Amino acid sequence: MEIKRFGRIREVIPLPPLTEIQVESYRRALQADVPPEKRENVGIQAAFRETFPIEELVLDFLEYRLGEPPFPQDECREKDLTYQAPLYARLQLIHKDTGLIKEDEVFLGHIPLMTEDGSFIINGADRVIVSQIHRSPGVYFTPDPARPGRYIASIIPLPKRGPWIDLEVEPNGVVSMKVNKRKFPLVLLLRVLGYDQETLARELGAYGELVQGLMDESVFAMRPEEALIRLFTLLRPGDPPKRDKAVAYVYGLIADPRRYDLGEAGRYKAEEKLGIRLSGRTLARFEDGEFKDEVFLPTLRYLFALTAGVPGHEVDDIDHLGNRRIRTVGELMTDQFRVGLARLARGVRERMLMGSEDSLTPAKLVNSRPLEAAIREFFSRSQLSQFKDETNPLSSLRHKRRISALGPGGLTRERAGFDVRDVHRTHYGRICPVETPEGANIGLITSLAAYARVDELGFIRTPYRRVVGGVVTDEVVYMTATEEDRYTIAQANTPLEGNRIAAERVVARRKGEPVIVSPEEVEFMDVSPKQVFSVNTNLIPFLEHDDANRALMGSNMQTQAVPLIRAQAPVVMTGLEERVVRDSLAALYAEEDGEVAKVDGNRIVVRYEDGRLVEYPLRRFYRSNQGTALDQRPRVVVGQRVRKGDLLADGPASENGFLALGQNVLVAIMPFDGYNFEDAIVISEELLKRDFYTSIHIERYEIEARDTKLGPERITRDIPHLSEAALRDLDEEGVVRIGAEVKPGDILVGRTSFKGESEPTPEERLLRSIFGEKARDVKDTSLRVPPGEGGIVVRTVRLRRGDPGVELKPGVREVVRVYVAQKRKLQVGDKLANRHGNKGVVAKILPVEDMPHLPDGTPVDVILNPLGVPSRMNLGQILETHLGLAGYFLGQRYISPIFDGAKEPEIKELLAQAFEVYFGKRKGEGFGVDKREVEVLRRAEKLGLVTPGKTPEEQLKELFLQGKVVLYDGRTGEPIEGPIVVGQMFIMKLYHMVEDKMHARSTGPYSLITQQPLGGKAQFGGQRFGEMEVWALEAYGAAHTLQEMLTLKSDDIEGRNAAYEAIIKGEDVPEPSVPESFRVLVKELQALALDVQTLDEKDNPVDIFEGLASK
Amino acid sequence: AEPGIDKLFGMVDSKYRLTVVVAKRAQQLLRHGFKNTVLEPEERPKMQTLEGLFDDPNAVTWAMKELLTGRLVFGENLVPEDRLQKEMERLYPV
Amino acid sequence: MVQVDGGRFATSDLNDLYRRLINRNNRLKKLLAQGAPEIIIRNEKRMLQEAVDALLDNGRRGAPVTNPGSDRPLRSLTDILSGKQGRFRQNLLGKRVDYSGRSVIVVGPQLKLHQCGLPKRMALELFKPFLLKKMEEKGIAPNVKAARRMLERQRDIKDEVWDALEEVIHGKVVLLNRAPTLHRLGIQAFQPVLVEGQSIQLHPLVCEAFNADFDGDQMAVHVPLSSFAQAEARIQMLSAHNLLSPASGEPLAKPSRDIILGL
Amino acid sequence: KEVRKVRIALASPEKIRSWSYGEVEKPETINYRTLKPERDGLFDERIFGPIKDYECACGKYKRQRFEGKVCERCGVEVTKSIVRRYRMGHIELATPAAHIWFVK
Amino acid sequence: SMARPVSIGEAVGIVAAQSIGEPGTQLTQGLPRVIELFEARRPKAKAVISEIDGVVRIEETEEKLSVFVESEGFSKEYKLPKEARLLVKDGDYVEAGQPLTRGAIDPHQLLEAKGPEAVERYLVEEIQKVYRAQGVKLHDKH
Amino acid sequence: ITIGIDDAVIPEEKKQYLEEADRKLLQIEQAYEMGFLTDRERYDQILQLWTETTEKVTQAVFKNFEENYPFNPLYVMAQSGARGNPQQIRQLCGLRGLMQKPSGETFEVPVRSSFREGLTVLEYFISSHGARKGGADTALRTADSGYLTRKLVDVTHE
Amino acid sequence: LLMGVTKSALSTKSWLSAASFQNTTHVLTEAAIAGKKDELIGLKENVILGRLIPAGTGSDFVRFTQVVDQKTLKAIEEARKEA
DNA sequence: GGGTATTCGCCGTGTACCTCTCCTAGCCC
DNA sequence: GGGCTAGACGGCGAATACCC
RNA sequence: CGGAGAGGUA
Ligand SMILES: [Mg+2]
Ligand SMILES: [Zn+2]
């Protein structure tokens, strides 16, 4: 069909690679391919140069290299391995005394590798490292909260790379420095750093009134050595003030480039703010046995200047995006690697004293254990290493661009107030103001912008077009917020003639403040509105008509769409669907020009111009992490000529390269017999008839055979006391045959385990005697289908002990995995939603003849409630519906970009064009206007929707131009008393389906300690009767119901047993007893040497244990 | 709502007393196999199944209907419990 | 000391604390048996005091004792008693119960005010013992054991058991709940009506009391067993008898969006 | 009877020694190999009671005909296994120790 | 819930607590005011109240302010900030526990001055004011 | 009952009110630059003028609905009390109003567009502040409400 | 004396309610020293003990109501008159 | 000696449900 | 190869701090 | 069938 697109804003640059934030960062961190002689001092090389050389014999580092991965990616996914590469380092041990040089390449463990899309494979699972936002290191000046006219000067190094230094001007005049909750006069440290009274007097003399609080003769009397001793006594009380200890402590606290590490970004921020030049990344230096200042004097000067009110000195906002930075996967991995390397270094230092002091080879000195331990700890247990979310390609693409403020060295849920959750003025173009998790995590988790990129220092930059004079140039500049605050930035949609600004007065921003400006004062201009929002939000058409609170839910719900087997690209796109599919790497594109040689459901063989015959295998029916089925489908034919970049295979949830997460349905907006009450949704059975909204899901079960002291577990078709019907579908090896249908209760894998030695109860002895059957030495431990599940078996994976290439957990002989698939249709309970935040569960599925239908006989599919619009204020869906009606009658699709899209008059023109096709056709076949249409037209002209006096055709056209048509009721046949809005809407089927959530329990397992029923659907547990439910039951005054909820349906053991027996016998339930949890509480209180005694009305003891605990 | 719940609430001074009366009457009816009722054969609670009309197995409905009739006497300290139980089991064996 | 299904050992921290305490106590006994100098006995008694303190309340004084190779502080008796996860607020003022279920809710306009649509499978699972009794009464099964072995599998269910189930629930009620339960009307009693599908059908007018909408909400079903509980539910907790809010005294079961619009 | 009051009070060493069935004296918990409880450990069977209902540890008495009897070989009483949930032990400290609750 | 005399045995405390707590999530002073009222916390910007009866006499220094409650036998002086708004004009008789400055009243001082009934009435009215402003109908009974 | 994009009717008086407000703002700026009133008074009078214009345009919207479209779906939904309040109807048909900075201060320029006409990217970014503020407010209020309810329940349980 | 809801709840006489509420260690130590005896007056104590709460159908005002039909009452009256 | 004033340590901050992963390391017989 | 051993915020009450 | 961490729904 034809594709028509509106919009006049012409973008000068295309979107960057949407996943560059991960890929480029990791590639810079590893420096794998670059020759070792030219690697820059960043990442792994930086950690190596920092840790080495260690003195104590002096071990020196030369270079490193990365080996080849032992197994390909799919193989690791198969056998639960980690896709990693071996890291070798060429180290040489040098003997300082004699000169012994022992050089060799040592193996230092493995490093996980990043896939082509930007995710890792850890223990067979796909994982993602989320970038973290935090405060940039450097020097900051804040207003003193209590004392108004005073300021606090903070010096903050990299996280975990030093202590936070605080400087304050006390009321009595002395400048107090705070380190590790210890406050002391800064004058002592100033004296330690080699400063004299005259030096401070001449430097800070411009601001007298504080220098007098700075002058202290007692510290000026003693030399820096005694001052250092006193300082060490002040910091570490109780430690003997020996000179060497004080020197070492103060050095490691300030001058140590290994223990105290100011950031490169921190050094840059300091050089920019204080206007000085830093030779290194530490506050002071230990040179010639003394200490030399680098930072303290200029920052003290700046503080004393600011507190006096000199012009040019301003406080810093701690939420300004020039003061907050992003750590990418590279920096986090490098930090963990540095920690592991420091542990390895201290270990090596330990080995350099024990053992043979002469026979020492670097292979004997270094132990690879701490490095591997730290790296595996980071990749497995860290708070930022998250399970990948891959319900559909858009979901993973969004997850790769997520920004978290929590994690190590970050905020917690309790210490996050309103300030950190707000939207600062500098998020414009850098962080999406709309997309954020709803609930407790609101504002803490965010998403990168569209055009936003992260530089090498870690600040988020955004592009702007340069404007010189009145002409808008074409070269773009990427700027940060600190640099952005210095210019006047015009808007993107200003009128333009050629390259000249045509408007006399433009809307511009100055430091986030909106203002009206003359063109000559405009210095920069925006690139496009797209740069203000994330990737998810950029997919919602007609966003300028939706409230933020609802566009939020729309953006969030687009992630949870399920890939259908008949997906369709929407009728109203935003022009960004192709780029998302291309960058998600789901689809398969042609590398170069050529011709397709072979096309099959399994692979595609292409002949390029070079003559080489390339073969792309298609990932077919593969299970994602969330249980959805991802598969590729060939979209070409033998002999087809393809160019560079053409589509070859269509990925999951995509239709010819366009993102297709749902379907286009003909929806009418009206209330329908109360079935639309409060967000419910009525659908037609025609959707089910032609396999719409049909999705495929794959469930995976796993069973292990392990060695038991009573004998090994066996997988075998022979199971005691089972009829052949239960073993019909099993093969000889006890595994189900591929293709057999399994239902709840059926056996997937037969497994027998040796019967634990137990004495048969005399009742069971009597049964065995009367039946004459011997009890088998083995019992049934076969894996069965849980209740509510089932489907078709598609794959069986088997890994034994003694088979080559695989390794298991100690004690496990073999492991078997079974994959089960099922086609899930739409039904009462599933969740539907559109892109503008309207969501609801399917409440009724009507026959085709009951649905309202257009006069030409076509029935609508979905019915929405109009009462959802006025309180939600999301008018985008109404415009999308109008445009969809126009398209459905014209047979085309539209592309309306965000904030520069189809306005109302164009939609009216399109609707007139569509009405021509819709009406002249009927006119030609020999039909006028219906009687019911005439009645509806009369009732409408009584409402003021049409103009009186015109012919019925003109009034019908006037109604159509507003998106309203005459509908007939499928039940009665009479028309609805008024015109109704009807059009095509794009609706996606969400992932929360009722089939996965329905659950019930009569009786089942119980806990060990508390003897209460278990929890969760997995363990067949029961619901929780919480505290508030007890409050409600008390408020009703229902005493016996509550007593039963607490004892009979709970941890009262003999009570519930007698209750079950009496119920199956037909009598009423018995009277309960004391719950077991109270006995547990009493015994726990006795465990604390506290005697708890239950008494009667006469204060006599009452035994609730029935003499079981009384000697 | 329940049939005649208003007249039921009118009969007692506290709704909880009505609840207790109904529960105890239902327990009595269950224990004595419905052959100790005060209703008449034509006004017994009926239940429509696939076959036809039968006796409703729910004792609470029987108790509420009986209470609506008015042939029941309820209160405090009408008779010692053991004597009541003995006379009830003697008049209607199990 | 539980051997997990995977064959590994999971040990309560109480075991570790007791082991440490008994170790230090035996060490002190052995040292007293030999008569070491006063300093050794002194530091040993200090360690014993600290071990007893850690057993009774870990972390109350000094650094919390933790496992080697971990930062997680051990869980002493005091930490078991108190707290939101402690014994009191977790296992005494609230419990998990049998004969319960949970599902998604869907509007049903055809139900009366005192009815609720219940799926057939949830009803067959909740009312299982009464169903076994009824099946034993009629000729559906010889005894309760055969009835259970008949019901255990889904492909073995015939149609007579559905009539039996319809006979069982005649007149009984179930409690519907939705979390969070803010006021006493968050739990209400309804008569069940067996319907197809897997969702719970709810009456429209009671939607305001529960503060429930149909954008994916879930509800929990509980079943009262005895005649006392049945009377308490049918008389005081039935939805048709609670029309006025106890807070203000104004009606709660009142017309809403569609109804008010039409009228 | 009927529970009407709940009194709580301090526990003298006499009442503590009266609660216990024996002294724990070895830090072992269970044999890692056989999975049987270690002798005199935190999980001993002679102190806290049997593991299986009506069955001694050594396997001499295994029926309800013997209840309250103590097997001479293993030293275990033959009752219901539920007693393993109620019976308490006691450790005899070499020197007194202060209860932290009444100190901090 | 039934528009009739309450039945003996009803759990009234739980019903009152729920009826007060449920509309809490709709209060945009609001919820912090309700919380500080139910906890009887001394307010931050607290008003000043006359402990004794008498006639008001303002004394205004260009840098200081004071109020004198003058009876026939007794006299009391209260020092106030310069910007503190006044609710009493000179030459007026004010009751014990009457607010002089605009602001919230400390409940403990009101209890020491005017007695229990005044504190109870004031607390009831002040707690009801929030739910009134938020358009929530709630009976004073709870 | 249905909802079309033409069911949100823009009144004619909106243009006249906006022009009057613009000329009033110009007068205020001219009077400010002459040193008659300081910055605080100028800010306050601007806020006052914009609030008066907002209430006027709300009154105009509702009078137009009442007079010329007594059966308009939005007007019926508001009058019958089924859904919506006057403020949301104003935001749909009138003007969005004034939005406040994260610090609490109100912006000088208001959002003169409505959802029926469509916003501009700048005004949308402006309103996102209040949106996020309200969201965080609710998310942090729920827990305090729960704690208060529990304290009350436990103090009066007997 | 006037005190907030927190202190008023913690200063109650029943130590089970205060122990379940907050500051468990403090309340438990004070009650253990004082040798307190909980009388089970409130609702939380009876909920903990798993007993019948003294409200609604569990209240002592209506818990002891008897039900008997006319025939059985008449028979009992005749049996008592002949005793 | 007493009558405040600060501060320092402890306790506390919603309910219900679903999915997944992960639960010590080193050395020596 | 397994076994053994080693970047809140409030309130509340006691303890000084300090001033007269 | 015990605890931590993460994400999500209402
Ligand atoms: Mg909802
Ligand atoms: Zn034995």
Numbering used by the authors:
A (entry chain C): 1 to 56, 64 to 1118
B (entry chain E): 2 to 95
C (entry chain D): 527 to 789
D (entry chain D): 3 to 106
E (entry chain D): 1210 to 1237, 1254 to 1367
F (entry chain D): 947 to 1104
G (entry chain D): 1420 to 1502
Please give sentences taken from the publication describing this entry.
Mfd is a highly conserved ATP-dependent DNA translocase in bacteria. It recognizes stalled RNA polymerase (RNAP) and removes it from DNA, leading to Mfd-dependent transcription termination. Mfd can be functionally dissected into an N-terminal region (NTR), an RNAP interacting domain (RID), a translocation module (TM), and a C-terminal domain (CTD). Here, we report the single-particle cryo-electron microscopy structures of T. thermophilus Mfd-RNAP complex with and without ATPγS.
